[PDB]
Amino acid sequence: GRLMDRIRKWYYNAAGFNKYGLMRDDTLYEDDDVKEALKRLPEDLYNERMFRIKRALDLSLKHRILPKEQWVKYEEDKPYLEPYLKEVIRERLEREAWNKK
Amino acid sequence: IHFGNLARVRHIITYSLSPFEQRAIPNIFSDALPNVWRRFSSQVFKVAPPFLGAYLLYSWGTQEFERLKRKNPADYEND
Amino acid sequence: VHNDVTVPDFSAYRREDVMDATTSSQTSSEDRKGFSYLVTATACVATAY
Amino acid sequence: APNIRKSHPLLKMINNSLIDLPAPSNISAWWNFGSLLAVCLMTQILTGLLLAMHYTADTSLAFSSVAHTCRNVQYGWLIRNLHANGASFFFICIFLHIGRGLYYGSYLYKETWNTGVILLLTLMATAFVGYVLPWGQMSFWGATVITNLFSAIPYIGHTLVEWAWGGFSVDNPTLTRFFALHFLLPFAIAGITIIHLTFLHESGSNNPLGISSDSDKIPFHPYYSFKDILGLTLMLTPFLTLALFSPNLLGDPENFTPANPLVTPPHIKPEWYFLFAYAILRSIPNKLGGVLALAASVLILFLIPFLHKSKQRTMTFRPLSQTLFWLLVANLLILTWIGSQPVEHPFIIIGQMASLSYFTILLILFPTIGTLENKMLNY
Amino acid sequence: WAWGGFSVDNPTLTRFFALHFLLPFAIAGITIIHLTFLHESGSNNPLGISSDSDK
Amino acid sequence: YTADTSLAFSSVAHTCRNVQYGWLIRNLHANGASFFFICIFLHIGRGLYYGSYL
Amino acid sequence: ELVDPLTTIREHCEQTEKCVKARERLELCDARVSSRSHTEEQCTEELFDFLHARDHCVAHKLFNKLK
Amino acid sequence: GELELHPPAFPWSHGGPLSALDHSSVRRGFQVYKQVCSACHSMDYVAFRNLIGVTHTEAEAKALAEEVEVQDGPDENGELFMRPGKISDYFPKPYPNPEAARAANNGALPPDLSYIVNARHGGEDYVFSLLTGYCDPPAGVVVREGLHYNPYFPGQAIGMAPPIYNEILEYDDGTPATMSQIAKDVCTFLRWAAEPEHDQRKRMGLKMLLISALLTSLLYYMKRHKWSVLKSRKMAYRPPK
Amino acid sequence: ALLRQAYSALFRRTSTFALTVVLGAVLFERAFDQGADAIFEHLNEGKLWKHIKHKYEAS
Numbered sequence A: 001g002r003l004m005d006r007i008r009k010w011y012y013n014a015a016g017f018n019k020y021g022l023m024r025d026d027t028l029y030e031d032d033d034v035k036e037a038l039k040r041l042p043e044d045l046y047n048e049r050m051f052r053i054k055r056a057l058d059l060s061l062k063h064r065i066l067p068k069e070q071w072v073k074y075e076e077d078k079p080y081l082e083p084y085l086k087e088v089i090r091e092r093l094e095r096e097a098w099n100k101k
Numbered sequence B: 001i002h003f004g005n006l007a008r009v010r011h012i013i014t015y016s017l018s019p020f021e022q023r024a025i026p027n028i029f030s031d032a033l034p035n036v037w038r039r040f041s042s043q044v045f046k047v048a049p050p051f052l053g054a055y056l057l058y059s060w061g062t063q064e065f066e067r068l069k070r071k072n073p074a075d076y077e078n079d
Numbered sequence C: 001v002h003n004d005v006t007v008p009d010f011s012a013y014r015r016e017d018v019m020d021a022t023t024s025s026q027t028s029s030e031d032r033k034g035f036s037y038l039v040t041a042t043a044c045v046a047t048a049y
Numbered sequence D: 001a002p003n004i005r006k007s008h009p010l011l012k013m014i015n016n017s018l019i020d021l022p023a024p025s026n027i028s029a030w031w032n033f034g035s036l037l038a039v040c041l042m043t044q045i046l047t048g049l050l051l052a053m054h055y056t057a058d059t060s061l062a063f064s065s066v067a068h069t070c071r072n073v074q075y076g077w078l079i080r081n082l083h084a085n086g087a088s089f090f091f092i093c094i095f096l097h098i099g100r101g102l103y104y105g106s107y108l109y110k111e112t113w114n115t116g117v118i119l120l121l122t123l124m125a126t127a128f129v130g131y132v133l134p135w136g137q138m139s140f141w142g143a144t145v146i147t148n149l150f151s152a153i154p155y156i157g158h159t160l161v162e163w164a165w166g167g168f169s170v171d172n173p174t175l176t177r178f179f180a181l182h183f184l185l186p187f188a189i190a191g192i193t194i195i196h197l198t199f200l201h202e203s204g205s206n207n208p209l210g211i212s213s214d215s216d217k218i219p220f221h222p223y224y225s226f227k228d229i230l231g232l233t234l235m236l237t238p239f240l241t242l243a244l245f246s247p248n249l250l251g252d253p254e255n256f257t258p259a260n261p262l263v264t265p266p267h268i269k270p271e272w273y274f275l276f277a278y279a280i281l282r283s284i285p286n287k288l289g290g291v292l293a294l295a296a297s298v299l300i301l302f303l304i305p306f307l308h309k310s311k312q313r314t315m316t317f318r319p320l321s322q323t324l325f326w327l328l329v330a331n332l333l334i335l336t337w338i339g340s341q342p343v344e345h346p347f348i349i350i351g352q353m354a355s356l357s358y359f360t361i362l363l364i365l366f367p368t369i370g371t372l373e374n375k376m377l378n379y
Numbered sequence E: 001w002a003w004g005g006f007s008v009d010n011p012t013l014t015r016f017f018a019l020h021f022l023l024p025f026a027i028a029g030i031t032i033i034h035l036t037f038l039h040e041s042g043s044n045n046p047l048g049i050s051s052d053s054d055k
Numbered sequence F: 001y002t003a004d005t006s007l008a009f010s011s012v013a014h015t016c017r018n019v020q021y022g023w024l025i026r027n028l029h030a031n032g033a034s035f036f037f038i039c040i041f042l043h044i045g046r047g048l049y050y051g052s053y054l
Numbered sequence G: 001e002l003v004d005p006l007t008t009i010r011e012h013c014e015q016t017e018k019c020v021k022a023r024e025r026l027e028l029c030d031a032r033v034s035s036r037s038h039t040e041e042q043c044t045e046e047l048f049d050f051l052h053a054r055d056h057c058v059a060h061k062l063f064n065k066l067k
Numbered sequence H: 001g002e003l004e005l006h007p008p009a010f011p012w013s014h015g016g017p018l019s020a021l022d023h024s025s026v027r028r029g030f031q032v033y034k035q036v037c038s039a040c041h042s043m044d045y046v047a048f049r050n051l052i053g054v055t056h057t058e059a060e061a062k063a064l065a066e067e068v069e070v071q072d073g074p075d076e077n078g079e080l081f082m083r084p085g086k087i088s089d090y091f092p093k094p095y096p097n098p099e100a101a102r103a104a105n106n107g108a109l110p111p112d113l114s115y116i117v118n119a120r121h122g123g124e125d126y127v128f129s130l131l132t133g134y135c136d137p138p139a140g141v142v143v144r145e146g147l148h149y150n151p152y153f154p155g156q157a158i159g160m161a162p163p164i165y166n167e168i169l170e171y172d173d174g175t176p177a178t179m180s181q182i183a184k185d186v187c188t189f190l191r192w193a194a195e196p197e198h199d200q201r202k203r204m205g206l207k208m209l210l211i212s213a214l215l216t217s218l219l220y221y222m223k224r225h226k227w228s229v230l231k232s233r234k235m236a237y238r239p240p241k
Numbered sequence I: 001a002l003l004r005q006a007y008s009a010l011f012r013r014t015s016t017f018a019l020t021v022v023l024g025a026v027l028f029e030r031a032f033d034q035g036a037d038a039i040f041e042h043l044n045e046g047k048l049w050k051h052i053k054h055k056y057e058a059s
């Protein structure tokens, strides 16, 4: 429903990672699927992500955040990793199911 | 040995000054405090709520317990 | 190119004596260090006690 | 190897864990408790040895030997103060150490976490036996009441109990074996602490944002050596202030009275750090069920790693989990409070609720809210 | 200072029990260090010549 | 055991006389200390003879 | 003869609106309890409220007049 | 029952975190103990030498100790025997053992007072409020024979008959021996007996605070000074883009 | 300019820095102690044995 979609944008703002300049995907815990997914990222997307994270960590150490202007906006958050992650998980399930078979 | 194998990093420049050129505790009023408040503000409503809800429970039960020690004059009327 | 790169401005953080881009920062060196080392030496004395 | 800090089989160790050890550039003050816990431990051991050197493990001399230590031994009173209060500091520190780990999902480092739990249990048993040593009224009845719970384990009940007591009731044989255990356990703690730090070093420290800190690591020294030393003095001031200005603040006055088997104290209650568990213990009326509830109240910690559903490591970016977390903390102050209150209405029902909520939050709510939160991120 | 008095007496006894209970653990401790240094080189052998050709 | 001049000697006697297998445990401990030294002296000897001290 | 500053201050305190109100409550209980054979009620609670208020008052003052 | 009365908070001269014990009040409290409580209450952990430099002179203390007969022994024939006291002796016990104690107090057992103030919730406030709080039972309350009414004592029926009354003794320093004055002095004394370190403990607490303040300060600067390198650090992303 | 002089004489060479910490502690102790006891005793005028002592000393 286009209602809970209001909820989403709410949560997104409540979470607050955008205040560090992080994209939703930059906050994913690096389990195994994510580890693999990242290895498949194009050089540029990978380095962009790297700087964003090193930037947040520097903010976090400083106990500061980004000026309101620079915060990532809900509709401008690039889910760059989700496509790859989605695939890494498909492949794994395939193998898993095939090995029980 | 963990320094050198850590991560693949490119195109990032950083600048820093010797500690003997800068201020140990700089901008206390223009920067420090403002952020201290910023931070305090953003958490109060997540933290305080349950602690307060406990204070109440505590305060009630402490009193409700003492009240049960006082006598009810309505047990010595009919005698 | 690296020629288009310059060190940001650290005015917001510089100690006074080395705030002026045209004054030898060496004249106030022994001063800025003597202070910070005095603090340290004192912590040592307190800890020794 | 050029510098003798990298090659030497011993200086290489001091170095690879306290000087060149890669630490996240942004770990907060909640990462200062590990070192405090350590220092605390070396401190307890040192003051303990100093006391053990004037103690006498015998029911006819225990109470008085401690009294003799405070009254006659040069600075004996001070060493005694520091030891009993140090045990508190130890727990305050350990509880925050745990909280921190729960909030920032450190438990994902399973072996580091599981060894942490073992350290907690060992520390609790340690303080338990150590408490019996001065042989006061609370020392005897605390020992009597708690160790008596084991007889509630069908079949081998009275057995394990009379074996542990070395007799038919808590008596001298129990005392002397408790002194031995109290003198021993701390070294096991130090032992296991080594293992704890070994597993930890495999991965390195976690950090407040819960994202790889590989792009920004810094040498433990001078950053964290100075940060940790400061964190020490900060805590130490209140510890000492409360110790030197209000010595008997935390202690029960019933322990200034020599144990007596023919006089049960009106209100038998543990030191502050056990209260919450005491509350959960009595919450379930039925000797066995209360024991099991107590057991699980701590053993539940071994389950946290498996009830993580979030796709993010910490709670820094999960507002729902945050409040639920603080609800839990407050849930614990309540149980604590209840633990110090007699078994009477309203306390009895408030207690059963707080217990019920405690397990509910950890077993049901937390894993659920995490799932719910993943969908709110469209994951 | 060691006796805790003017002659070997009770104060000496109680501090000896504590030391006796303690030292053995230090022995275990140091034993670990002993075996660590040893493992750097490996064991020596009756002929005193490199045993690398036959481990 | 009881670390007190008025009870030490007897606490050990009590251990041997009253404690289940206390006599055996006491024997093994005192004699174990000897074994310990016999072993350590040969350990050292070996080391001196075969130049392990290097 | 010497006087116990306690008894003095004890008297002066029993004047308090707090004491007077408490004191009155007691005399009433005592009266109805004393005039009834075979009963439970005990004027403990009332006695306590009075003693609590009186003694509370005594505390601030009493030590001022002690060496 | 199930109702209890809590003592008030008297402003003791030694209540302040930095306020020592009034040694003049402690000296008097000793007399009260020596001449009144000691007839029924033992104080096993205090010795005459403990008075020296605290409330008495060395000469005074030795005297106090000789006023007592102590049982020593054995001798050549293996016989016990009396002897005058030494400053190394502890305060004399009133009875040989609890059984004898109860027998002389109607089955009641007057406790050792060495750690009394720390052994009772209330401390000197509780002991003071009890000594000076004896009165008649309210309506409906009957105290069994041998027992006395005291609201401050749990159960209100205490086996101790009011130990002190005005001029029950006289201070050789010339202080008005009123009942409340007496109780006040013995209570101060009881605090000392439970923790002789009291004063030193607070003198240290003071030094601990100053040094603690000074050091926490310095170390905060040092920590900040080192971290300044990171706190002010700036960075940029410069892809060949 | 003491900071300058101090830095050149005391904090420069690690050897003199340590030597400074020692004499610094020696002096600081002597001073901190007197001041501390002086504060403590003054805060407790006439309550300590030290004070009431005269009343019973004189053979």
Ligand code: HEC
Pocket (backbone or CB within 6 Å): H032, H033, H036, H037, H038, H039, H040, H041, H105, H108, H109, H110, H111, H116, H120, H127, H131, H157, H158, H159, H160, H161, H163, H164, H186
């Ligand atoms: C023997 C005739 C007594 C004299 C003289 C004093 N006390 Fe006593 N005291 C006595 C008895 C028999 C009891 C037992 C009360 C009971 O029923 O258990 C006591 C008890 C106390 C207590 C408190 C006991 C408690 O709180 O449980 C205190 C603190 C106490 N006594 C103090 C005290 C002091 C200061 C005295 C001299 C001024 C003193 N007592 C004299 C009997 C007698």
Ligand code: HEM
Pocket (backbone or CB within 6 Å): D030, D031, D032, D033, D034, D035, D037, D038, D041, D094, D097, D098, D101, D104, D106, D107, D109, D112, D113, D115, D116, D117, D119, D120, D189, D193, D196, D197, D200, D204, D205, D206, D207, D301
């Ligand atoms: C004897 C008690 C203990 C000691 C001496 C100890 C010591 C340490 C030390 C020194 C660290 C590193 C710095 C820090 O993060 O604080 C650490 C980390 C850690 N400890 Fe403990 N610990 C103890 C008990 C426990 C307990 C009870 C738990 C949890 C059940 C635990 C869980 C952890 C975990 C998970 C980490 C990882 C921290 C991170 O996120 O980087 N520890 N501990």
Ligand code: HEM
Pocket (backbone or CB within 6 Å): D041, D044, D045, D046, D047, D048, D049, D050, D051, D052, D053, D055, D066, D080, D083, D084, D087, D090, D123, D126, D127, D128, D130, D131, D132, D133, D134, D182, D183, D186, D189
């Ligand atoms: C993990 C470290 C330790 C903890 C948590 C600890 C805790 C305690 C506790 C709670 C008590 C009772 C304090 C009181 O209320 O009186 C105690 C007493 C005692 N402990 Fe420890 N202790 C530790 C280590 C040691 C060690 C290593 C020794 C021996 C070398 C020791 C010797 C004693 C002695 C002699 C007593 C009895 C005297 C007294 O009560 O003060 N302790 N300890």
Ligand code: HEM
Pocket (backbone or CB within 6 Å): E027, E031, E034, E035, E038, E042, E043, E044, E045, F040, F043, F044, F047, F050, F051, F052, F053
């Ligand atoms: C707590 C007592 C000791 C323990 C537990 C211990 C243990 C060990 C162990 C297990 C070995 C390896 C196997 C062997 O060659 O026997 C070893 C080797 C050795 N130990 Fe010890 N040792 C002890 C005391 C000493 C002493 C007193 C010396 C000499 C002062 C010593 C000198 C050596 C040396 C030099 C080796 C090298 C052996 C070789 O390969 O030639 N150890 N020790």
Ligand SMILES: CO/C=C(/C(=O)OC)c1ccccc1COc1nc2ccc(C)cc2nc1C(F)(F)F
Pocket (backbone or CB within 6 Å): D121, D124, D125, D127, D128, D129, D131, D132, D138, D139, D141, D142, D143, D145, D146, D268, D269, D270, D271, D274, D275, D277, D278, D279, D281, D294, D298
């Ligand atoms: C010898 O007894 C010592 C007690 C104590 O407070 O230790 C510091 C004590 C005193 C009074 C009542 C109860 C205790 C001990 O309590 C506990 N002691 C425990 C010791 C170890 C573990 C794993 C759990 C424990 N749980 C408890 C619980 F509070 F839940 F009953």
Ligand SMILES: CCCCCCCCO[C@@H]1O[C@H](CO)[C@@H](O)[C@H](O)[C@H]1O
Pocket (backbone or CB within 6 Å): C049, D236, H200, H203, H204, H207, H208, H211, H212
């Ligand atoms: C945080 C570290 C605080 C250390 C505080 C050291 C103060 C202890 O100082 C002590 O004071 C006593 C009373 O005057 C003296 O009798 C002792 O000799 C003295 O060492």
